[PDB]
Each structure stands twice: as structure tokens, then as C-alpha cells.
Amino acid sequence: PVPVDGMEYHWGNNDPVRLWSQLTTEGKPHGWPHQIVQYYYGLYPAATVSAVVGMSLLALISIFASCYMLVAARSKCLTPYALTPGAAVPWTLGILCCAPRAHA
Amino acid sequence: YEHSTVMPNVVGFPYKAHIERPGYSPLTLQMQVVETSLEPTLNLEYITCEYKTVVPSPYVKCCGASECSTKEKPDYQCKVYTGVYPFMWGGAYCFCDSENTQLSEAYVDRSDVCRHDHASAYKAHTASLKAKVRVMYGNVNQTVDVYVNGDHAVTIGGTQFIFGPLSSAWTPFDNKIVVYKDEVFNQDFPPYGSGQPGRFGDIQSRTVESNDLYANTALKLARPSPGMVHVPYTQTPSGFKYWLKEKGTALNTKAPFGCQIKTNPVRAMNCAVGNIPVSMNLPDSAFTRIVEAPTIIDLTCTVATCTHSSDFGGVLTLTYKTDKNGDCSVHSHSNVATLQEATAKVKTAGKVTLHFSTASASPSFVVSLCSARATCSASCEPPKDHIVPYAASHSNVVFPDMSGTALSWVQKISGGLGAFAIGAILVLVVVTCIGLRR
Amino acid sequence: YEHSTVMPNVVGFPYKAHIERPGYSPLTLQMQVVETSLEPTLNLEYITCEYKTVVPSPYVKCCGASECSTKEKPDYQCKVYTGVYPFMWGGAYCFCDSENTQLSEAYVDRSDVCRHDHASAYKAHTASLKAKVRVMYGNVNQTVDVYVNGDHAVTIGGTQFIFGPLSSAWTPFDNKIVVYKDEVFNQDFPPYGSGQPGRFGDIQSRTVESNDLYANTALKLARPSPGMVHVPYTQTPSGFKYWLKEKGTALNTKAPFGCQIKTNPVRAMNCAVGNIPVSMNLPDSAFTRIVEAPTIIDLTCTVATCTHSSDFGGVLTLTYKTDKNGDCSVHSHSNVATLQEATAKVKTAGKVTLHFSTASASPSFVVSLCSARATCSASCEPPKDHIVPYAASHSNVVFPDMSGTALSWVQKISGGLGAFAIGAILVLVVVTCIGLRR
Ligand SMILES: *[C@@H]1O[C@H](CO)[C@@H](O[C@@H]2O[C@H](CO)[C@@H](O[C@@H]3O[C@H](CO)[C@@H](O)[C@H](O)[C@@H]3O)[C@H](O)[C@H]2NC(C)=O)[C@H](O)[C@H]1NC(C)=O
Ligand SMILES: *[C@@H]1O[C@H](CO)[C@@H](O[C@@H]2O[C@H](CO)[C@@H](O[C@@H]3O[C@H](CO)[C@@H](O)[C@H](O)[C@@H]3O)[C@H](O)[C@H]2NC(C)=O)[C@H](O)[C@H]1NC(C)=O
Ligand SMILES: *[C@@H]1O[C@H](CO)[C@@H](O[C@@H]2O[C@H](CO)[C@@H](O[C@@H]3O[C@H](CO)[C@@H](O)[C@H](O)[C@@H]3O)[C@H](O)[C@H]2NC(C)=O)[C@H](O)[C@H]1NC(C)=O
Ligand SMILES: *[C@@H]1O[C@H](CO)[C@@H](O[C@@H]2O[C@H](CO)[C@@H](O[C@@H]3O[C@H](CO)[C@@H](O)[C@H](O)[C@@H]3O)[C@H](O)[C@H]2NC(C)=O)[C@H](O)[C@H]1NC(C)=O
């Protein structure tokens, strides 16, 4: 094995010979997002996966929180109209979609 | 003008230091570590070598008796036997048929060649580092030898240099060491006066010429066979010869950080670890007045090709506008890129070229030519050769710039998500305010 | 029979160890530290001695001029003067009225007697201890030289002794040491190659035999007077003579714990601190079978007189009943009292006397004769002499026995107060129980 640090071997009476590895891989940088991941997975194939999973999880958490907040805001805005025998105000119906499409 | 810096303790690394005096043009020095030596301090414990059994001729006293006499000899053994009837080639002497005695004697002694082939037992502590450094600046070459500790000042062409103590205190030698010819072993040897037969240290001497000797080889005598004169004995084989055959490995093929162990004196050479602080004191003759240095304006930086390989695999181009032609000092202010040259020829044409090596996909650094500044960004492709026989010439920094392609994509996605969340917050706040104002 | 003990590192203190094999009569050892020695490890830095200024004859060039030539000499100074008109005893030469020239030259070199009067500059670390212990028991009495570290076993009459490492790691030498003849100084000397004129280290040499030399004494030349040939110069006096007159104090008359500092080699002798553990390995011939030793029953201890002085100021007696006469081994199982003898000759008369030294007003200790046992207690009066010229022979413990007079008074008072408190508690409990039952 020849890691990036390098190594030496001693064969017979010859002098020791040292060999050093080099930063080479099989991915393609400066391309589509699915190629940079391969390029940075060729190097250090234990932190790239963790970073990708963390970023994806954070994005999912943020988008779920935002969607829930929109739903809660709509529910808070529309619930006063349900406590009275009133109308739907089709102006608000167009912008805010509700369960009653046309019936009340 | 006093100055201070830190340089890596890697042999052959082209370290370059930048000095920016506010009344003079900037100067660039080059320092390179050619050779180092980690020197431990040794205390001799004892000396071991192959032994040799001395067995004097028997004294067959017959028609009488003999008594054993004690002596102060190492591992001495003596006994007296009764009823011997020895024989010789011409016949059997000692007329008395059964009233004869034989006295056997034997002891141990240090061998004849112990002063050419012996093993030493040492105690090692408090290593001392010594180095040989090459410095060049302006027109001054030369190499010097320096003790690496904060108490040795060497003058090189009017400049005083003090190399500070090493950052780390790591030594490859354990507390106890056994040295043989040109091999060092991390071994735990038995204490003086408590050696066991058949293993290392069965016989011990405080020094090669010392008279005292402690030998424990379990020498035991036996009764001679009838009708012969031979003084039989039995003895456990030598422990030094055993140790020669099953010592196992060494420290020359075991030491970390790839540093060769040598002997006489015991030392570890070219052993890369830690940082070496440097303290400097330069005279006024080394610098150049700012009026004499050419004025550089409108400095722009461009990159032709970039491959983050171990060798200098990058080409850089600088465009500028000057009034006169002279010499500038070229430096890079970030360790992500290392320049090959420290001085460049400036001309009225307005184009100079430089070579740099990087280890990151998208490097970004600031380069200065005399007093001007410029920012360089590049896109580098990986190399194709898997293995090379020379060390890396970069600082091994992998993290790309914030303006790189991957970081740009991350920025775009994060900005989109943040905009969505901000819109969510605004809608919720508007609805809550409308509800509260009711 | 393996054994272990801990004995104080005080010179001349008669330590006694008790060994009690279950199958044999008890044995008592006596070990005494005759002399110690603390050996530091030194690294030579440089050698300083008085300098000597070498000034050659001037070269007066009549009707011409001369040019200065640089040389590689320690603190070399050469200058050329013009317009000189020298004289001599019989007349004036250099017929040319004003076109003459004198070349002045001077430099510094190490003195003639530097190999006899010089001061060294060392670095001291990792002190090593050395001792000389006298061991006596039974019919054995010898003195041995032992390294105080658990890697040296010495045999005394078939018994193996291993003296463990010192309890503490205190050393009186600082990191930097200056040695002159037979004196040691705790000083911080300037680094090599950076000495200042007029103080210690104005000229420095790596070794007395070394060829190189670094000198800095600010030697400066001056223009000669008209009509004279003398080569004027001025120089700051030697820093060695300033140091020799203003060194200040020493370590011989300043070391703590009352230990003398000696030189060649550098060492500190008889320096009391810490404890030295002892490991032993005794043969089966040293003890005596319990059937052979006399049997002692009905042991009673009485004290005639007591006086807690430095010497053995206590007289103690034993009464017993025995079947046969022989030898026992007396011992005190507490360090409050230290006995004088480790063997008392037992006779059928049933009365032996012993001496002991104590440092407490009322001591209480348990003493054993052969296999017997008894508890001793006495009242001791202070001594009258204010100052004595010999060291204390006791362990210097002051707290008295719980059965002494003062503690008896304290116990009686505390018991009375506790009885009062218990009575009050009982009254309160009875009253509150009666109140609760209603
Ligand atoms: C020449 O040969 C004769 C052979 O008889 C030697 O005579 C032997 O001399 C030894 C020395 O005294 C005798 O040993 C003694 O034995 C008695 C017990 O008998 C013992 O009590 C003494 O302490 C001593 O050990 C030995 O007995 C005797 N031989 C006989 C048969 O009696 C003679 O010594 C020889 N000449 C020389 C110069 O050796
Ligand atoms: C300061 O001094 C050093 C040592 O004199 C200079 O290094 C030396 O540089 C020359 C080339 O300028 C080397 O000569 C060539 O070396 C190669 C090595 O493969 C050989 O194949 C050629 O035939 C030729 O001899 C010389 O070896 C080299 N010395 C060492 C010890 O490496 C250095 O260049 C000087 N500083 C400056 C700024 O010039
Ligand atoms: C005997 O005495 C006469 C005195 O005149 C010496 O003549 C002097 O010779 C020196 C030779 O170096 C002349 O010095 C030179 O002078 C010229 C012009 O000033 C200058 O350019 C040179 O650099 C050099 O210093 C000196 O002038 C001359 N004196 C005169 C002409 O009055 C003569 O050398 C003596 N003979 C000896 C010393 O053997
Ligand atoms: C165990 O052996 C040591 C010696 O290995 C004995 O030391 C002896 O100690 C006494 C008193 O400390 C020495 O006597 C002195 O002699 C000098 C001679 O000038 C005299 O001036 C003094 O007044 C005193 O009488 C004696 O020389 C010395 N023995 C030697 C040095 O061989 C020790 O006494 C032995 N243990 C016992 C219990 O005897």
C-alpha cells in the first residue's frame, strides 16, 4: 500500500526507494452536481456521504417547516369564517384554496 | 528590523518568507532544511558479550585426599570425588586401588573478542535537535549548521538568525535501548546483578575494560566416568548467541515518520515532525529604497492551465503597467498555492509569467508584484499519473474557494430555500397582524 | 522469603526492619545510609576565559599609500591613516613632507593560560542518585555501594537487596549552571554567538581545544598623535574580570536541605529528602526454627526514667518467665519510640533492660521480645539543654497518647458535657412523649 504520505521498501543490498501517491480519482469536477459528488467521493470516501446526508436532511427539515407554516397560517386565517353562518368571499377562495370548492 | 516566522520541518520544502518594511520595497527570503539530527542523551548501564568456560586440568591426588578451596571467581564451581582409578596410555598410575581422589575446577570468564563484538544497554532521554539550513536572498547563497533551540545565533551576511525550539517533543526512542553495531532496539533488559541464564544478559560487565563480572549460567559439575580423566560438566548455552538469532525486528525498519536511525552516535535523521520558529534581524543594506523600485499599477492576474499535481502544475500570467524596468519580489499570501520563483524580471512590455502548485480543486489567492496586488481564481483538473517518486511541493490544502462551482451550487440552493422560508415568515406575520388588529 | 519496606533518607539514622515468618522466629535488620550523592547530567555549552589583545607593529609607508585588507580573525579591526610625519630617536624619516601613510592593525585572541583558568557553562537535567548503605544482621556486617533506582540488585551474604527509586524528584540545580573551579552557580548565561561586551561571555569558545572563537569587545582604533609611532586604541575591559568580582553568592552556601555542593564531577552529597523503598529476598538459613528459640511468656513492661531529648534518654525494662536461655530480637512497632539495640540476651533471671529515644510528652508503644508482646507507657519530662551538636535520633512525632494526662482531662470534661446533653435530651423526649400521649 502507498498512501498519500508515501512509503519505502528495501530489496536486497540496494538502497531504499521511496514512492509517493498522488491525488487522482475517477470523477469529474466542475460539472453537474452528480459528478462533483463522485469526484469528492474518490477522495476521502467517508466524509462526502456524511456531508451530503446532512445537507439533504437540513433541506428537508427547512422545506417541511415552511410548508407546515403555510398550512397553519391558512388555517388560522380561514377559521373565523367557519364560526358564523356567513359566506366564503370568493376573492379569498381564489387565493386560499379550501375544502369547500363550491358548496358553502 | 526584527522579524519572526514559522517554517515547516520538512526536508526540501521551499519555504519563502515575506518582509514588508514601510520605508522600503518588499523583500523575499528562501529557507530550506537540508539535514536534521535528533540526538538523545545516553547513560551506559552494562555490556554483554559471549562468555567462555575455563576448565583447568584435574589434580588426581592419590594415596591421600584433597579438600576444595573457595575462590572469588565468577560462577566458580569445585568438587572433590572419591574412588577414581584413572588410566593413561602406558597404563594406570596411582597404585592405591580405591584410595584416590580427583579435584574438578571450572568457572566463567569474559571472551577474548568481547572488545570487538558486544552489545550495549543504554538509557535514553531528553533528545537534542540539530539541523543544517540553506538560506538565500538577494544575491546571498550559503548553508549553515544550527542547534535547533532558542540559544544559538548565527550570522549570515550581516543578518542574525535564531532558530527557536521545536514545536513538538516527540522522540522515537523508548526509555531503554539496546545498541548493536548499527541497529537500535526498543528492548527492556534485566537489571544489573539479576540476569537469568540462557537469555539476554546472562553475563554482565559495567564497562568493556572493567574488572568486575557477574555471571549466572548454571554451571554444574558431574562425576567422571570410571577409568578416564576428563572433568565432565554441563552448562546452559550462551544467552548472547541466542539473542542474536531471535532479537526480532529493529528500529531502523520500525521508526515512524520515515526517519532513518544511525549509530555512533545514536541519532535519528531527516525526521519530519513539527514546526521550527525563526527569529531574524536584518540590516538596512539588504532592502531597497522605494524610489529605486519600479512603480506597478493596474495589476491583473490570469491562469492558463491548472492541474493540482505534486509538481508545479500551474501557469500564471500577470499584466501590468510600469514606468521603468527592474526587479520585483513575488509572493503569494495564502498557503493554498506555492510559487516557484521569489523574484521576477519586470519590463515595459507588461507581461510576466509564474509557476505555482496547488492541491485544491478551485484555488483562490492574492499575489503581489513589488507593491501591487491582484486576485487569482482558477479551475484545476486532476492529474492522470497514479504514483510519482518525489514529494509534494504544496501545503496539502483541499477545501475549495467559496466562489467555486460546488460552493456556488450550495449557495444557490441555500438562497432559494431561504427565500421560501422568508416568504413563509412574511405571510404568517401578515396573517397574525391582521388577526391581532381585529 | 520476599519482603518490602520503606526507610527514611536521613544520614546516620539507625533504621530497623522486622521480619516475621510464620514458621520461624522473628528477625531484625539494621540498615544505615552512610553517604549519598546526587549526580546530574551535563551538556557543555561554551568556555569563557580572559582575552588578550594582539597589536602588531605599524607599517609606515614613506612617499606612498596603502590599502586595508579584510581578514577572518575574531574582532579584527584595521584602519589606514594619511598625512602622518613620524619621528625616531636619531631623527625623522619619510622625507616626503605630507605624502606618508600609516596602517594600524589589531585583533583579539584567547589568552595563553585559558586552559588553566576558565569558567564552564553547562545545562543540567535528570539528576541520578547514588548511595552507600551499611547492612548488618545476625553475624553479617558489610557496606555496599548501590544505585538508588529499581534496576540494581546487590548481594550481601546470600540476600538480594533492591533499593527502589527515590520518593521525590527534587534537585537543587537549575536548568542552567556555571561552574568555576570548585563552585557552582545558578546563573542564566547569554546564548552562544550573542554575547555582550563587558559582561560574562564577551568571548566564547565551543571547547577549550576548539579552533573557532567568537569575540565582541568593541575594539576601536584612533588616529595617532603628530610625530609619534604608538598605534592608539580603546577597548572595553574583559567581562570575565567583572564577573569574577561581581558574581555574587554561590550554591555551596545557599543549597537547601543542608547538602554540600562539590565539583569534578558536579554532585550534591548527603542531601536529606524523601524515602527510599527497599525490596529484599532472604534465604532460609538466616532465620531460626521456632523450636530452637526460647519461649517467652508473661511479659510486663515498666519504664524507669524518660526524657524526650535528642539522644537515647529513656530506660526501659522487661520481666518474663522463660524455659531456656538464648537470644531474641526486640523491636518497637510504633515510630513514636526508637530502640537502640536489636538483640537482647535472654536469661532465666527474667529481667532485661533496653534504651529508647522519644520526642513526645507521653508515648505509648508496643514492644515484642521473641514472640511475646507488651504495651509500654510512661511520663516524660523536658530536657534542660537548649542546644546540642548532634542530630535527633527520634522520628520527631509530638502528638501524645489518648491515655496521657492532658487527653485524660479532655476526655473527662467531654464526658461530663456529654452526660449533661444526654440528660437534657432524655428530659425533652420524655416531656414531648407525655404531651403527645394526651
Ligand atoms: C607406595 O605405595 C604404597 C602402597 O601400599 C603407599 O602406601 C600407602 O600410603 C598411604 C599414605 O599414608 C596410606 O594411606 C593411609 O591409610 C590409612 C588406613 O590404612 C589411613 O589411616 C591414613 O590416614 C592414610 O590415608 C595407604 O594405606 C598405604 N597403602 C597401604 C596398602 O597401606 C605409599 O604411600 C606409596 N609411596 C608414595 C611415596 O606414595
Ligand atoms: C547555492 O549553492 C548551491 C550549491 O552550490 C546551488 O545548488 C547547485 O545548483 C547547480 C545548478 O545551478 C547544480 O548543478 C547541477 O546539478 C544537477 C543535479 O541533477 C546536475 O545534474 C547538473 O549536472 C549540475 O551539476 C548543483 O548540483 C546544485 N548543488 C546542490 C548541492 O544541489 C544553488 O543553485 C545556489 N543558489 C542559487 C540561487 O543559485
Ligand atoms: C627619494 O625621495 C624622493 C622625494 O621627492 C621620492 O620621490 C617621490 O616618489 C614617490 C613614488 O611613489 C612619489 O609618489 C607619487 O607621487 C605622484 C604625484 O604626486 C602620485 O600620483 C603617485 O600616486 C605617488 O604618490 C612622490 O611624488 C615623489 N616625490 C616628489 C616627486 O617630490 C623618492 O621616491 C625617494 N626614493 C625612494 C623612496 O626610494
Ligand atoms: C560493622 O562493621 C563496621 C566496619 O565495617 C564497624 O565499624 C567500626 O566502627 C567503630 C566505631 O564507629 C570504629 O572504631 C573507631 O575507630 C577509630 C579509629 O581511629 C577510633 O578513633 C574511634 O574512637 C572508634 O573506636 C571501627 O574502626 C569500625 N570498624 C572498621 C572501620 O573496620 C562496626 O562496628 C561493625 N558493627 C559492630 C556491631 O561492631
Q: Is residue C70 within 8 angstroms of chain B, CB to CB?
A: no
Instruction: Measure in Å the smallest separation between the Cα of B150 and chain C Cα atoms.
Output: 8
Kindly give the pairing relationship between strand C2-8 and strand C15-19.
Answer: unpaired
Provide the edge-to-edge strand list for the sheet that holds C337-339: C296-306, C314-322, C351-358, C337-339
Q: Is residue C175 within 8 angstroms of chain B, CB to CB?
A: no
B388 lines ligand 1 (CB under 6 A): no
A70 contacts B431? CB cut-off 8 A = no
Classify residue B296 as exposed, middle or buried by CB count within 10 Å of its CB (0-12, 13-18, 19+): buried
Distance B59 CA to ligand 1 centre (A): 18
DSSP conformation class of C80: E
C-alpha cell at C190: 547569554
Largest CA distance in chain B: 144
Q: What is the dihedral of CA B396, B401, B405, B406, to 10 degrees?
A: 70
Q: Is residue C67 within 8 angstroms of chain B, CB to CB?
A: no
Residues B115, B94: Cα–Cα separation, whole Å: 44
Contact yes or no for B360/B308 (Cβ under 8 A): yes
Residues of A engaging B, defined by a Cβ cutoff of 8 Å: 2, 4-8, 10, 17-25, 29-31, 33, 36, 39-40, 43, 55, 59, 62-63, 65-66, 69-70, 72-73, 76-77
- What b/e sequence results for B377-415 when a residue is b if at least 16 CB atoms lie within 10 Å of its CB, and e otherwise? ebebebbeeeebeeebbbbeeeebbeebbbeeeeeeeee
Residues C198, C178: Cα–Cα separation, whole Å: 18
Element (H, E) at C332: strand C331-332
Q: How far apart are the first and last CA of chain A?
A: 76
Q: How many other C-beta atoms are found inside a 10 Å radius of the C-beta of residue B300?
A: 12
Residues C176, C125: Cα–Cα separation, whole Å: 9
Give the resolution to one decimal, in Å.
Answer: 3.5
Residue whose entry in the numeric block shows the C-alpha cell 580427583: B102
Q: Quick one: which of C151, C164, C43 has its CA closest to B121?
A: C151
Residues C330, C339: Cα–Cα separation, whole Å: 8
Residues C421, C90: Cα–Cα separation, whole Å: 121
Q: Which distant-in-sequence residues (6+ apart) come within 8 Å of C202 by Cβ?
A: C48, C51, C195, C196, C215, C216, C217, C236, C238, C239, C240
Mutate to test the interface with C, among B123, B151, B162 (most CBs of C within 10 A): B151
Distance C221 CA to ligand 3 centre (A): 28
C-alpha cell at B364: 483562490
C-alpha cell at C369: 521480645
Element (H, E) at A50: helix A48-78
Q: Is residue C412 within 8 angstroms of chain B, CB to CB?
A: no
Which residues, listed in sequence order, are joined to residue C297 by a DSSP beta bridge?
C321
C-alpha cell at C304: 524507669
Residues B31, B88: Cα–Cα separation, whole Å: 84
Contact yes or no for B254/B282 (Cβ under 8 A): no
Q: What is the dihedral of CA C72, C76, C82, C84, to 10 degrees?
A: -130
- What residue type is assigned to position C279 of the chain? S
C-alpha gyration radius of chain C: 39
Q: With contacts defined as CB-CB under 8 Å, which chain A residues touch B426?
A: none
Subunits in contact with chain A (3 or more CB pairs closer than 8 Å): B
Peptide bond into C74 cis (omega under 30): no
C193 contacts B153? CB cut-off 8 A = yes
Q: Quick one: which of B241, B222, B216, B384 has its CA closest to B313?
A: B384
Is C touching A (3+ C-beta pairs, cut-off 8 A)?
A: no
Q: How many other C-beta atoms are found inside a 10 Å radius of the C-beta of residue C370?
A: 22
Residues B246, A2: Cα–Cα separation, whole Å: 30
Q: Between vectors from CA B38 to CA B35 and to CA B39, what angle results, nearest 5°?
A: 125
C141 lines ligand 4 (CB under 6 A): yes
Q: Which residue of B has its CA nearest to A42?
A: B382
Give the CB-side neighbour count of residue C64, counting CA atoms within 13 A: 7
Q: With contacts defined as CB-CB under 8 Å, which chain C residues touch B43?
A: 41, 128
Contact yes or no for C168/C273 (Cβ under 8 A): yes
Q: Between vectors from CA C265 to CA C261 and to CA C267, what angle results, nearest 5°?
A: 35
DSSP conformation class of B419: H
Q: Quick one: which of B166, B184, B187, B183 has its CA closest to B175?
A: B187
Q: Quick one: which of C61, C55, C54 has its CA closest to C102?
A: C61
Q: Number of helices (H) and strands (E) in chain B: give both, helices first.
A: 2, 29
Backbone φ and ψ for C312, nearest 5 degrees, come out as -75, 95
Residue nearest ligand 3's atom 32 by CA: C96
Backbone φ and ψ for A72, nearest 5 degrees, come out as -65, -40
Q: Quick one: which of B388, B380, B392, B397 has its CA closest to B337?
A: B397
Contact yes or no for C180/C241 (Cβ under 8 A): no
